[PDB]
Amino acid sequence: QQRLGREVEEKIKQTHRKYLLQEQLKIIKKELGLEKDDKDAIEEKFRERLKELVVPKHVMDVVDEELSKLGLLDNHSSEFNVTRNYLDWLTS
Amino acid sequence: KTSIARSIARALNREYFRFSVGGMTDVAEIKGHRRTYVGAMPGKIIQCLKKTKTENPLILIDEVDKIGRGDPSSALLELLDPEQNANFLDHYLDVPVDLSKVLFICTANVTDTIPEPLRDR
Amino acid sequence: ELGLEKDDKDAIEEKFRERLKELVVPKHVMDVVDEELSKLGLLDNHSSEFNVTRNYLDWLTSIPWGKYSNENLDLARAQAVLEEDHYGMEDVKKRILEFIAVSQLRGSTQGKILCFYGPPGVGKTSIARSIARALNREYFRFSVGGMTDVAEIKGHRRTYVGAMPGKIIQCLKKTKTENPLILIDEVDKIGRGDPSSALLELLDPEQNANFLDHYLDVPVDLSKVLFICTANVTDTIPEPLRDR
Amino acid sequence: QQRLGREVEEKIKQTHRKYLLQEQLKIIKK
Amino acid sequence: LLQEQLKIIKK
Numbered sequence: 001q002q003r004l005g006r007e008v009e010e011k012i013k014q015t016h017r018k019y020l021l022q023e024q025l026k027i028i029k030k031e032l033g034l035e036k037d038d039k040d041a042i043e044e045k046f047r048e049r050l051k052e053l054v055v056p057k058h059v060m061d062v063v064d065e066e067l068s069k070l071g072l073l074d075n076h077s078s079e080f081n082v083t084r085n086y087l088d089w090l091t092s
Numbered sequence: 093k094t095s096i097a098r099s100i101a102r103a104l105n106r107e108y109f110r111f112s113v114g115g116m117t118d119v120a121e122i123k124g125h126r127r128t129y130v131g132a133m134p135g136k137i138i139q140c141l142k143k144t145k146t147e148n149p150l151i152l153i154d155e156v157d158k159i160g161r162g163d164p165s166s167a168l169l170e171l172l173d174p175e176q177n178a179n180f181l182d183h184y185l186d187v188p189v190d191l192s193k194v195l196f197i198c199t200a201n202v203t204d205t206i207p208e209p210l211r212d213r
Numbered sequence: 214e215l216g217l218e219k220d221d222k223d224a225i226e227e228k229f230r231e232r233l234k235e236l237v238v239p240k241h242v243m244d245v246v247d248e249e250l251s252k253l254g255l256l257d258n259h260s261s262e263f264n265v266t267r268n269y270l271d272w273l274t275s276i277p278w279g280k281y282s283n284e285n286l287d288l289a290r291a292q293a294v295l296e297e298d299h300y301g302m303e304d305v306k307k308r309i310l311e312f313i314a315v316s317q318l319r320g321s322t323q324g325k326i327l328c329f330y331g332p333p334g335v336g337k338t339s340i341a342r343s344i345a346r347a348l349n350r351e352y353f354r355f356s357v358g359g360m361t362d363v364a365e366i367k368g369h370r371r372t373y374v375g376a377m378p379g380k381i382i383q384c385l386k387k388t389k390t391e392n393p394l395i396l397i398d399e400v401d402k403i404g405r406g407d408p409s410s411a412l413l414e415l416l417d418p419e420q421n422a423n424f425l426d427h428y429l430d431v432p433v434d435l436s437k438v439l440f441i442c443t444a445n446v447t448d449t450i451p452e453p454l455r456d457r
Numbered sequence: 458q459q460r461l462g463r464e465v466e467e468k469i470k471q472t473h474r475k476y477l478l479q480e481q482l483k484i485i486k487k
Numbered sequence: 488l489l490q491e492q493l494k495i496i497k498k
């Protein structure tokens with residue numbers, strides 16, 4: 001009974017469809033990357049708020065410490081979210 | 093007592109915020125929560141400074157006599173201290189802020205029920 | 214290897230290690246630091262475990278192991294600066310002078326726990342700065358008023374996302390000295406979730422010499438830290454705290 | 458209308474570069 | 488500007 005083999009072939013076809021879906025996702029992201037944000041743009045985004053503020057020395061040290069670790073973490077870590085949200089409050 | 097607070101802010105051209113502490117029981121509304129906890133936010137005062145975009149707004153603390161128990165009354169001691177406002181500490185920021193320029197107005201219907209540490213400040 | 218991108222990130226080891234050159238690290242802390250540094254060298258720099266280890270080592274190498282502020286043992290100028298800021302208050306000034314004299318006799322820095330209680334507006338909170346100036350000790354203040362979370366005193370385990378050591382270790386990192394002056398205001402108005410059982414581990418000469426923090430998980434010697442506690446009335450402070 | 462062909466070509470080039478980098482990393486590991 | 492919008496819509 002080659003029905004199991006036919007099902008395995010259908011699963012392989014589904015895997016090929018997943019590969020095509022990944023290729024299409026890359027194709028879409030190629031144009032979707034425009035007008036987006038990244039780890040380097042967020043640094044100046046936070047720093048421009050401090051331009052017009054008379055920031056005390058200790059707050060400046062804390063901000064520099066958080067920005068220093070900001071560039072080390074990746075864009076998807078939960079700790080990255082925690083520090084980004086902390087900076088969003090601290091620099092506002 | 094409540095209505096004059098907005099008129100004073102209009103005359104002084106200061107930003108205005110109304111903080112109804114009466115009936116409140118959660119201390120976290122004043123001093124916030126640590127960064128570790130998920131969904132943590134700073135206290136009410138930090139949001140006041142954030143939304144007013146000024147370090148010297150008019151904060152109206154309504155019904156100080158109706159504060160709850162079981163205790164934000166001790167947390168107010170770090171917020172209404174005539175000389176300790178320069179280093180008010182919020183648990184989310186974990187950074188002292190200078191609240192000495194903020195004009196605090198507190199409303200109370202009866203004097204006798206305010207605790208002595210707050211009544212003397 | 215030349216075609217692929219390569220970075221000399223291994224310098225982070227001596228980047229951390231240079232902080233311990235002027236410190237006097239105890240053996241038990243140094244062993245943990247060495248094991249953590251060895252673990253860091255194997256983790257990929259993109260791993261979350263690598264970031265946790267890096268933060269742990271950053272906290273470990275920032276504690277001022279063996280650093281002490283140059284305490285002023287001169288009685289005359291210590292008394293003069295105490296009379297400079299506050300009038301009256303003979304008892305507290307006498308207590309501070311006795312503390313300085315005892316520290317001078319034994320030839321080493323001394324740690325003690327003092328509690329100031331009385332009517333509001335007598336100068337209990339303000340004198341902490343004058344005492345710090347007299348002793349040349351670094352000054353720090355945190356209020357336990359309405360304290361209901363133990364995590365402020367003991368911190369959180371580093372397994373959790375974004376854990377921090379807590380108030381005492383933050384103070385140790387900030388003041389960069391192992392003998393600062395701690396002012397714990399409103400000790401008589403501490404809340405419950407129970408932080409009152411955590412202060413007993415801090416305000417106790419018999420166990421504060423090996424204070425264990427949930428984040429660092431390494432004992433530190435707080436026996437030389439001068440603790441000052443402000444209260445409004447004595448009869449509401451917990452009995453174990455009033456005992457010490 | 459014709460921008461789709463240019464976008465697809467750019468995406469294919471980026472994917473090819475990424476796969477070449479992955480293959481080089483695998484060769485280096487081997 | 489419309490060409491970029493058309494490509495974005497198609498994607």
Ligand SMILES: Nc1ncnc2c1ncn2[C@@H]1O[C@H](COP(=O)(O)OP(=O)(O)O)[C@@H](O)[C@H]1O
Nearest residue numbers: 093094095096097098099154155198199200201
């Ligand atoms: N001196 C005053 N002049 C004009 N209106 C007043 C005056 N005092 C109170 N009011 C009126 O009373 C209303 C409610 O007052 P409120 O601020 O609630 O008093 P309280 O703060 O004592 O409760 C307001 O809408 C206001 O118009």
Ligand SMILES: Nc1ncnc2c1ncn2[C@@H]1O[C@H](COP(=O)(O)OP(=O)(O)O)[C@@H](O)[C@H]1O
Nearest residue numbers: 175298299300301332333334335336337338339
């Ligand atoms: N003996 C004193 N001499 C001079 N000023 C004093 C004295 N006692 C209190 N003060 C003043 O009182 C103010 C606040 O005192 P504080 O330390 O808040 O008292 P408490 O600790 O009882 O709340 C300080 O700015 C200080 O100048």
Ligand SMILES: [Mg+2]
Nearest residue numbers: 093094095199
């Ligand atoms: Mg009213």
Ligand SMILES: [Mg+2]
Nearest residue numbers: 334337338339
């Ligand atoms: Mg005081």
